[PDB]
Amino acid sequence: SQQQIAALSESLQATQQQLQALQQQCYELEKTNRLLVSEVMTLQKMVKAQ
Amino acid sequence: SQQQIAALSESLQATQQQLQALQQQCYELEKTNRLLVSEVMTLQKMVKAQ
Amino acid sequence: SQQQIAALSESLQATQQQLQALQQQCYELEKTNRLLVSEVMTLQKMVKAQ
Numbered sequence A, B, C: 001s002q003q004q005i006a007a008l009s010e011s012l013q014a015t016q017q018q019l020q021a022l023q024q025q026c027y028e029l030e031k032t033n034r035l036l037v038s039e040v041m042t043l044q045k046m047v048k049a050q
Helices: A002-048 B002-049 C002-049
Strands: none
Touching: A002 B002, A002 C002, B002 C002
């Protein structure tokens, strides 16, 4: 029926929006991981200087 | 009709559950990264202050 | 209608495929995280012994 189709269509829409937000979280994680690489390397350099 | 819609509804319920697990996984990585950033910045300060 | 049903089925399958992609991305982000955790632990020891 139309009511069943709309309910599934809305539930799928809610899921698809949650997945786009997760995709963004992943990108942000990739970013933080890179910044940490950099700060860890900085720390490594400084420990090595003494 | 209904039984196809039911099938898809049930399939979506599975995808939505996997999606919750992934959200939780990313939350745990975000937490870890907060801890690492805090640590690394403190340790940098410590080494510099020697 | 059957066309609405087929359209939802395709949409669901697309969402599921993307979710799988994200899952595998998250597996790589976890591995990187693990590396960083190890490296930071190592530095933490050293700095404490400085």
